Design a protein around this nucleic acid. Structure first.
Ligand SMILES: [Mg+2]
Ligand SMILES: [Mg+2]
Ligand SMILES: [Mg+2]
Ligand SMILES: [Mg+2]
Ligand SMILES: [Mg+2]
Ligand SMILES: [Mg+2]
Ligand SMILES: [Mg+2]
Ligand SMILES: [Mg+2]
Ligand SMILES: [Mg+2]
Ligand SMILES: [Mg+2]
Ligand SMILES: [Mg+2]
Ligand SMILES: [Mg+2]
Ligand SMILES: [Mg+2]
Ligand SMILES: [Mg+2]
Ligand SMILES: [Mg+2]
Ligand SMILES: [Mg+2]
Ligand SMILES: [Mg+2]
Ligand SMILES: [Mg+2]
Ligand SMILES: [Mg+2]
Ligand SMILES: [Mg+2]
Lengths: 199, 47, 102, 109, 117
RNA sequence: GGGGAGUGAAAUAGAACCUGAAACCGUAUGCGUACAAGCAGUGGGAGCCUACUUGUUAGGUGACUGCGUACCUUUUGUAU
């Protein structure tokens, strides 16, 4: 089971940790999360919104040139884009069961690959980045994700200036961070939190 | 790793583009055929 | 000293010590090869030809190397019909060296 | 060998080729005489370039003006100024006013 | 995400013009005329791989007939005389013997006569 | 307008100034063309020149010779 660094097993539920790893579900979950974080800020211009281009440049017949109806046409140089895109939302509907199943799937591979480090308790005394660096040097971890039951103010003020370390919460973690960071640091208060959230 | 995982085979397709090349299969027409109502912009037969 | 050996469904004008490019055959590099399909053997003025084939005559050769030569292009283009197709090709070969004409 | 250039000359490129090929490969003694009595506008410009080229060899080098032979002469095309010219029935046509780059190169070999 | 296609089209244009070099006039320096000269050249190249075997076959037959008529036979009778037996020497290595190895060609022709066909 | 001399890491970064291609227009060396008819190419191929490791190898010319009526669209049908 999840051997804590204090030399004590915990006997987690085997449905969340230690399950089949369906990678298509995880791919869908991370794609949906990464697309949902994008803000849609795009605005080109059709042939109707470009300034000018009201009247025909010349007659239909007798001129010798091609049939032109307006200056601001997509074929013309200064005309508008034929398929100009207004701003739109990029948000995929992911089911509540499907999102939780992706968490249960990735947390199993985190245990299998030994990326998950569980600790009895992780807490800092005062806000100071070097103190947290020394605290992490005890475990010998670099580029680690810190997941805790509650993000303390002292812990949050630290690690913002730190380069590769990020602090999250069980109700604030995402499928992307759990795979991105090299190591994930959970607490015994947090592994119980996943029980009621996932299964 | 985000650099490793993918979808299952057949779950994702590529949205074939009409009007590109000639080896693509949909070249120069886009599967519309030839002259007629159903070959032009807004060429929608009413239901 | 020249013979006529059939290697790949075709025959060649082979002399005693001439390099020759032949179609690919299942044999490694450096191994010796014997041709028991010699059709005529000549030596100076004494020339003999095979009834279906020359009896007792052999040509010993060894493989120098393998490879692919002279990439050629294939274009199947139809005018005015919206059809064109391209393809490449490099035919395998086997450079051999001739040692003796038995 | 030394060279001399005239980047930007009013005469067009085509008209100046017929004088350049007339002196390409001669001695400077008679190259200056051919252009001294040629009837074309390009002759005056090309002789002004050739005398500057000879003076460059005389000053920057110890080459005498007698042994020099004009080796390489080529006339390129330079910027052309575009202007309109009215014509009949309202139509207006565009007129280009061409220029050329003349490069006379003399060698003491 | 705007894609400008001014760097990948130059590669294809130069690739076509590299194959279209050595042609007269505009066929080797303007793309719209060079592409046709490449397509037509590829078509001729494809057809001439077939026609090469016909043209060499016709040349070998003509040379073998000339070499045989000097000995006292015709090509139509020579091939029949060879096929009464099984000499099984191809036209490529009969035209080579007709020119260079005239003694060997004569030694083949006399045996073809001896075949009585 | 140029040829020098100097500045600068670099003036073929010299003000019309980072890179600076294609159409277009020239100058040099090699080869072929003034008795030979047509989508200008492809298969074969003499001679010449340059290169080598000194030619049953490499590159550029292509005399000559068999076949060969461009691309796209509309069409029952196009060199048309
Ligand atoms: Mg309007
Ligand atoms: Mg109106
Ligand atoms: Mg615009
Ligand atoms: Mg919800
Ligand atoms: Mg089709
Ligand atoms: Mg149409
Ligand atoms: Mg119709
Ligand atoms: Mg239809
Ligand atoms: Mg008027
Ligand atoms: Mg003009
Ligand atoms: Mg200095
Ligand atoms: Mg430069
Ligand atoms: Mg520079
Ligand atoms: Mg400029
Ligand atoms: Mg810069
Ligand atoms: Mg510049
Ligand atoms: Mg010229
Ligand atoms: Mg003619
Ligand atoms: Mg088209
Ligand atoms: Mg009709």
């Amino acid at each position: 089971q999840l051997n804590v660094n204090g030399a004590q097993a915990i006997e987690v539920s085997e449905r969340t940790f230690g399950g089949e790893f369906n990678e298509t579900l995880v791919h869908q979950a991370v794609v949906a999360y990464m697309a949902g974080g994008r803000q849609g800020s795009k605005a080109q211009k059709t042939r109707s919104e470009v300034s000018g281009g009201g009247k025909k440049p010349w007659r239909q017949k007798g001129t010798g040139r091609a049939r032109a109806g307006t200056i601001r046409s997509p074929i013309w140089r200064g005309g508008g884009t034929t398929f100009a895109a207004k701003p739109r939302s990029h948000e995929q509907k992911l089911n509540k069961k499907m999102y939780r199943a992706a968490l249960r799937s990735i947390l199993a591979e985190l245990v299998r690959l030994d990326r998950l480090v569980v600790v009895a308790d992780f807490a800092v005394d005062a806000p100071k980045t070097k103190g947290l660096v020394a605290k992490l040097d005890t475990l010998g971890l670099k580029d680690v994700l810190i997941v805790t039951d509650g993000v303390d103010e002292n812990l949050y003020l630290a690690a913002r200036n730190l380069a590769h370390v990020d602090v999250r919460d069980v109700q604030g973690s995402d499928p992307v961070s759990l795979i991105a960071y090299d190591k994930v640091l959970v607490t015994v208060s947090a592994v119980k939190k996943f029980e009621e959230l996932l299964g | 790793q985000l650099n490793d995982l993918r979808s299952a085979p057949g779950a994702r397709r590529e949205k074939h583009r009409p009007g590109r090349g000639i080896g693509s299969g949909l070249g120069k027409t886009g599967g519309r055929g030839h002259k007629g109502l159903t070959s032009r912009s807004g060429g929608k037969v009413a239901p | 000293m020249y013979a006529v050996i059939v290697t790949g469904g075709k025959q060649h004008k082979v002399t005693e010590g001439e390099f020759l490019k032949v179609e690919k055959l299942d044999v490694a590099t450096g191994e010796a090869i014997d041709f028991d399909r010699v059709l005529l053997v000549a030596n100076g003025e004494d020339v003999k030809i095979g009834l279906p084939v020359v009896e007792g005559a052999k040509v010993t050769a060894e493989v120098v190397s393998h490879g692919r030569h002279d990439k050629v292009r294939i274009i199947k283009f139809r005018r005015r019909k919206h059809h064109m197709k391209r393809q490449g090709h490099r035919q395998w070969f086997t450079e051999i060296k001739i040692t003796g004409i038995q | 060998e030394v060279a001399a250039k005239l980047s930007g000359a009013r005469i067009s490129a085509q008209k100046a080729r017929l004088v350049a090929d007339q002196i390409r490969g001669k001695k400077v003694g008679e190259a200056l005489n051919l252009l001294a009595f040629s009837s074309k506008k390009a002759a005056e410009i090309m002789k002004k370039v050739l005398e500057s080229a000879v003076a460059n060899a005389e000053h920057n080098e110890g080459a005498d003006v007698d042994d020099l032979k004009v080796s390489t002469v080529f006339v390129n095309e330079g910027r052309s100024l575009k202007r309109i010219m009215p014509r009949a029935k309202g139509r207006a046509d565009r007129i280009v006013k061409r220029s050329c780059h003349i490069t006379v190169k003399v060698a003491d070999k | 995400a705007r894609v400008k296609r001014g760097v990948i089209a130059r590669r294809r244009h130069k690739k076509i013009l590299k194959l279209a070099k050595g042609y007269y006039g505009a066929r080797s320096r303007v793309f719209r005329v060079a592409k046709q000269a490449v397509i037509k050249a590829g078509q001729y190249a494809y057809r001439d791989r077939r026609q090469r075997k016909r043209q060499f076959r016709a040349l070998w037959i003509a040379r073998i007939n000339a070499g045989a008529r000097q000995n006292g036979l015709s090509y139509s009778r020579l091939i029949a005389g060879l096929k009464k037996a099984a000499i099984e020497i191809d036209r490529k290595v009969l035209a080579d013997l007709a020119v260079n190895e005239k003694a060997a060609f004569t030694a083949i022709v006399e045996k073809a006569k001896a075949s009585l066909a």
